[PDB]
């Protein structure tokens, strides 16, 4: 519910698309288990697709810890200080690949209600409307029922 | 936090009677200073016009007395004493509602130690003792009198009808029987704790009680007016008006006396003084007692019918 949740306006981080686009994803940290049925998708993701992902985008630092865990996880850290943690528990390799690509695609801004899906900083070019726009003037600026 | 205080809290054993004496002397001097309105700077005195209204006064209810007429009939009268009545302030026609001019008139004098500071400043500027009550009279512009002038009982003349307004005797929270004259319920034929109840208050269809319904509540402590009370006698020495019948309120209460507004007495003031009664320029003092022509005076030949 919108009345029961926060909200924000549509925005960029540092005017991303104005000059050069920069990848907002900074780090991906993977907790995967040596043994354990829940870390099998993560195990094969590390086997095959983590190297190609790192080669594909070199602005992201990827760590893989390989520690005993019941729930494998991925923590995404973004240039604006945002931290997001996701569970890759009992997920297929395609699911994990879609998840990490989505993480690399998003920015660090909060995923909440967006409030008017456009952000213009110069909404008016010919001048914002005021009650005197589209209103003609009078001689000597004489208001109604005046004398001189 | 500032503690409260009264006038004689920090005064000394010797300073209390001195302060009382001095304040009373100043009060009496101020009262005596206003004894000659026609010599200070009187406002112009206009002749009486047909559609004109003059000022009333504030009196004190003294009590009731018997009175007899030349035909032997008995009427009970109420004595209203004018203690210290002065005109306090006058507002113009256009400064209140544009309908009629107003004159404020004050009642009996009270202590200066127990009044609001704004009221004290007002009375200091006027140069008069504070008054217990102030009542406003609607007048025509030709009847205005200068503030501070004294008003006397001879302002009203015998053979005249007045209206008397006062706060009636308060009886507190009263049951519906005494308050509205409701009949109660039988006393012994089986009734269960229902001898003075109002009974039903409404019907079932409406599902509520109408605003004007009569129910138990506070009774008596409201302003009410007695209309068309004939004055029988004026006592000039003590400033007493003898008004026919009863007057609302308890004795020693302050009442507002003014000419009756009943249509039968619209223009009867052709023979009444019309700035007010001014006892300075009269050039002839009134008798101690002015009577009505139908009243058996105390010194009478002991009337015998024929």
């Amino acid at each position: 519910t919108a009345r029961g949740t926060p909200s924000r306006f549509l925005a960029s981080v540092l005017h991303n698309g104005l000059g050069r686009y920069v990848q907002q994803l900074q780090r991906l940290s993977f907790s995967v288990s040596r043994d354990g049925a829940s870390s099998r998708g993560a195990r094969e993701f590390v086997e095959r697709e983590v190297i190609d992902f790192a080669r594909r985008n070199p602005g992201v630092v990827i760590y893989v810890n390989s520690r005993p865990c019941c729930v494998p996880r991925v923590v995404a850290e973004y240039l604006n200080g945002a931290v997001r943690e996701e569970s890759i528990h009992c997920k297929s390799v395609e699911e994990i690949s879609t998840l990490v690509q989505k993480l690399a695609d998003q920015s660090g801004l909060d995923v909440i209600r967006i409030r008017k899906p456009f952000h213009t900083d110069n909404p008016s070019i010919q001048g914002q409307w005021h009650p005197f726009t589209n209103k003609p003037t009078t001689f000597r600026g004489l208001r109604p029922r005046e004398v001189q | 936090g500032k503690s409260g205080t009264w006038w004689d809290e920090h005064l000394s054993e010797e300073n209390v009677p001195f302060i009382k004496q001095l304040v009373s002397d100043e009060d009496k001097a101020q009262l005596a200073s206003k004894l000659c309105p026609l010599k200070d700077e009187p406002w112009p005195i206009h002749p009486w016009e047909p559609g004109s209204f003059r000022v009333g006064l504030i009196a004190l209810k003294l009590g009731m007395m018997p009175l007899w007429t030349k035909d032997g009939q008995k009427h009970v009268v109420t004595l209203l004493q004018v203690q210290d009545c002065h005109v306090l302030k006058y507002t113009s026609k256009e400064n209140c509602n544009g309908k009629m001019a107003t004159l404020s008139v004050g009642g009996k004098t009270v202590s200066r130690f127990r009044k609001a500071t704004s009221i004290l400043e007002f009375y200091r500027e006027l140069g008069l003792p504070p008054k217990q009550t102030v009542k406003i009279f609607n007048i025509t512009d030709n009847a205005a009198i200068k503030p501070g002038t004294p008003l006397y009982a001879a302002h009203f003349r015998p053979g005249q009808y007045v209206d008397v307004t006062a706060k009636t005797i308060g009886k507190g929270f009263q049951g519906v029987m005494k308050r509205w004259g409701f009949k109660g319920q039988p006393a012994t034929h089986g009734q269960t704790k229902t001898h003075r109840r109002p009974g039903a208050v409404a019907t079932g269809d409406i599902g509520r009680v109408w605003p004007g319904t009569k129910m138990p509540g506070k009774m008596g402590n409201i302003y009410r007016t007695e209309y068309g009370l004939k004055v029988w006698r004026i006592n000039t020495k003590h400033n007493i008006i003898y008004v026919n019948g009863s007057v609302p309120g308890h004795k020693n209460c302050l009442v507002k006396v003014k000419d009756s507004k009943l249509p039968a007495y619209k223009d009867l003031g052709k023979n009444l003084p019309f700035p007010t009664y001014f006892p300075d320029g009269d050039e002839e003092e009134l008798p101690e007692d002015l009577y009505d022509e139908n009243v058996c005076q105390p010194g009478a030949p002991s009337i015998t019918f024929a």
Partner: protein, 59 residues
């Protein structure tokens, strides 16, 4: 609140502060159907006579 922002006067008199506040008088919706006596005799001459009456009539 909208009624508090409304000011009504029965005649031509308006307070001076309100008059100094006034802007952009609105035009009247009705058209004032222009009674007979204010008709600029040129207009009477322009309007035609629809019927010739008998000379021997009293009205």
């Amino acid at each position: 609140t909208m009624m508090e922002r409304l000011h009504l006067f029965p005649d031509e008199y308006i307070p001076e502060d309100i008059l100094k506040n006034l802007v952009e008088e609105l035009p009247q919706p009705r058209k004032i159907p222009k009674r007979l006596d204010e008709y600029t005799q040129e207009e009477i001459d322009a309007f035609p006579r629809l019927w010739t009456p008998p000379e021997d009539y009293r009205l």
